[PDB]
């Protein structure tokens, strides 16, 4: 039992760890702890390497031993807190982080970890403060700097934005050049001016973390099917998602599994998350051929075994590097063909994914180098929404003349019966828009809006206030049910001037960048009386956006903020705007479908990353190419023309209002059949004896 002998083995393991050989490091750390057990450093190092192998319980054990041996070991506290956070023990993580700060007030890593815990809980102001404290203790701290950079992005804090972006690029440059895990998350990387190669390298590295966690399983490669004989001529497709529930993913594709052709396909749905009781989860469980709750199988080795023995041919990754992802399942390759579909707007960077389902308008062959996987093109757009199914009451509308189409709006499944009950109704032809003229009925509706009342009854029909949806029917409010009443939606509800062009953007404020606010300021200045409609998403960003708005010459009233609303109210109130200004940095993907379903045109400026070219692809599939701008000048000009030429605004709004139903954008049955065609191409390729290659 020689401590110097164990010290030499410990340093030997540290070298082997720094050579990316986690298993040799493990062997030597345990070798050191067998020579001299009371070796606090060896316990913590073996804990760190076991933590990244995924053996959290064992890592926690060795962290406690190191802290027992030397209680002043603040580093073991913060790293034990990281282990507890990975175990969903946030309570214990806080105690570890705060006890480390108590023991060593100058220990920056504990402050940074405490900032991360606040960030994960939505406490962005407090996460910012703790990151700043950590950077004050340790100025060179890439994890603290990059995470703080994301927080400032979330709240639209653009102080020293240009210098920050350059520092982020250099940090990623260095970390990639030193074979270290980049401090920028791959999902965040599409917000900073990195090279496409930098982005792909970040994604590849975050995917190799999965390999480090599955290599400890020692699982042998699987035998994959080579035909459809056992499947009865059916192609077995497995959709893996942690978002079968009240998540935007289900809001886009919940009707897709039920629309597969049962003669050719067998649909497997693997939920990575437990049942949240929402109707989205109910619909997918009912309509899918099989539904497997992989959240009941934590072991990725066994969960991959379950997928393999189900006989999946094409396994679809709908998470990417997002919350709830379990891409270790895809790393064990239980299926012969593995593809990325919707949940992640980027490349996996890794080789356990073979394809990425996209379109030619979002992923052109020129930028086909930003994707590690091969490209699988869909006919028009890879993007789909379930708005035709979730919000059919928004299929037709009516207005009240106090003749705009977006000032006092009515929607309802039983609307046409109510309009026929009224004596005088004017039909503005275009299919057409009824107008309720000013009369005792209209007076009562406006009184209900003004008085703050929840609902009224007119000729026996239920007239509901658009702001009271959640107390009239909570599942109608969340989009789980179609409203059974008639809903009134006015500009006075949200403070929109009744005589103004209303530009809107209901995306999260993290997608706005200083240049985008500059373009919007230019557009608002050139269109007199126009307003910009944004959401408190988050609310702490509202003063920051307002501050930069004043700097660009816009007075206070030019930008109007409104609270975030339930899914149904959010989509319905998009009817009140005239034009939607999309965020060029990161396009509104689900928000883009939401605004287009309302019949509201959307000006976009496609970029180079997939995240920046989705809205353009949506507009191309819709059939509105005049809304797609090739540069900043054209983006501003298009929006100004829509805002100043009311006749042109009227024609384009009618164009969107009709092509939402006519174009394939919202036709889920078409999308599924084309998805099936692409699936069959991929299998024909593979069964012919071909490793994955581009599809068109």
């Amino acid at each position: 039992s020689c401590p110097t002998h164990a010290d030499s083995l410990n340093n030997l393991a540290n070298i082997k760890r720094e050579q990316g050989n986690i298993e040799e490091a493990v062997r030597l750390y345990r070798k050191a702890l067998e020579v001299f057990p009371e070796f606090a450093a060896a316990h913590s190092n073996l804990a760190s390497v076991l933590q990244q192998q995924g053996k959290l319980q064992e890592a926690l054990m060795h962290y406690k031993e190191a802290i027992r041996i030397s209680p002043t070991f603040a580093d073991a506290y913060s790293n034990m807190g990281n282990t507890l956070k990975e175990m969903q023990d946030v309570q214990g993580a806080l105690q570890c982080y705060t006890r480390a700060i108590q023991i060593n007030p100058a220990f920056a890593d504990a402050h940074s970890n405490l900032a991360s815990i606040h960030k994960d809980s939505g406490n962005i102001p407090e996460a910012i403060a703790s990151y700043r404290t950590a950077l004050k203790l340790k100025p060179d701290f890439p994890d603290a700097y990059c995470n703080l950079a994301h927080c400032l992005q979330i709240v639209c804090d653009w102080t020293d934005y240009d210098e920050r972006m350059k520092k982020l690029v250099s940090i990623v440059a260095d970390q990639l050049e030193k074979n270290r895990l980049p401090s920028v998350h791959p999902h965040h990387s599409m917000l900073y001016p990195l090279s496409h190669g930098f982005r792909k390298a970040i994604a590849e590295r975050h995917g190799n973390l999965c390999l480090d966690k599955i290599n400890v399983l020692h699982k042998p490669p699987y035998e994959h099917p080579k035909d459809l004989k056992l499947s009865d001529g059916r192609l077995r497709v497995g959709y893996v998602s942690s978002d079968f529930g009240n998540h935007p993913t289900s809001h886009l594709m919940q009707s897709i599994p039920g629309m597969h052709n049962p003669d050719k396909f067998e649909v497997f749905c693997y939920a990575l998350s437990p049942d949240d009781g929402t109707n989205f989860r109910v619909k997918v469980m009912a309509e899918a051929n099989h539904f497997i709750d992989l959240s009941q199988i934590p072991c990725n080795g066994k969960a991959a075994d379950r997928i393999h023995q189900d006989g999946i041919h094409i396994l679809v990754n709908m998470n990417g590097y997002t919350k709830g992802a379990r891409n270790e399942l895809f790393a064990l390759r239980p299926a012969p063909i593995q593809a990325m579909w919707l949940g992640y707007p980027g490349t996996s960077g890794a080789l356990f994914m073979d394809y990425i389902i996209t379109d030619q308008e979002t992923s052109p062959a020129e930028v086909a180098e930003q994707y590690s996987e091969k490209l699988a093109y869909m006919p028009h757009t890879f993007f789909i929404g379930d708005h035709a199914n979730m919000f059919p009451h928004l299929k037709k509308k009516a207005v009240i003349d106090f003749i705009y189409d977006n000032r006092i709006v009515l929607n309802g499944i039983d609307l046409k019966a109510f309009l026929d009950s009224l004596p005088d109704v004017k039909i503005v032809k275009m299919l057409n828009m009824p107008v309720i003229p000013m009369n005792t009925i209209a007076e009562a509706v406006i009184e209900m809006i003004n008085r703050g009342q929840i609902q009224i009854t007119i000729n026996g029909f239920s007239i509901s206030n658009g702001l009271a949806t959640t107390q009239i029917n909570n599942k109608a409010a969340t989009g789980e049910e179609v409203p059974r009443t008639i809903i009134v939606t006015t500009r006075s509800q949200y403070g929109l001037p009744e005589d103004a062009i209303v530009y809107c953007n209901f995306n999260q404020l993290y997608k706005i960048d200083p240049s985008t606010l500059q373009m919007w300021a230019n557009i608002l200045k050139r269109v007199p009386n126009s307003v910009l409609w944004l959401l408190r998403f988050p609310a702490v960003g509202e003063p920051n956006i307002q501050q930069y708005a004043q700097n660009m010459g816009l007075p206070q009233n030019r930008i109007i903020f409104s609270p975030v609303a339930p899914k149904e109210e959010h989509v319905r109130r998009g009817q009140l705007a005239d034009v939607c200004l999309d965020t060029p940095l990161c396009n509104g993907h689900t928000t883009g479908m939401d605004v287009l379903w309302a019949g509201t045109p959307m000006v976009t400026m496609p970029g180079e990353t997939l995240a920046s070219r989705v809205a353009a692809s949506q507009l191309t599939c819709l059939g509105c190419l005049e809304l797609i701008a090739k540069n900043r000048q054209e983006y501003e000009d298009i929006a100004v023309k829509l805002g100043t030429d009311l006749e042109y605004l009227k024609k384009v709004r009618g164009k969107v209002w009709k092509q939402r139903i006519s174009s394939p954008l919202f036709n889920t049955k078409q999308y599924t059949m084309e998805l099936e065609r692409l699936y069959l191409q991929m299998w024909e390729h593979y069964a012919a004896g071909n490793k994955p290659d581009h599809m068109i």
């Binding site: 006092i408 809006i449 703050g452 929840i454 702001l467 009271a468 006075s492 509800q493 403070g495």
Partner: peptide, 10 residues
């Protein structure tokens, strides 16, 4: 409470 941001007049 569902009051509007401003009110619509006669």
């Amino acid at each position: 409470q569902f009051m509007p941001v401003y009110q619509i007049y006669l």
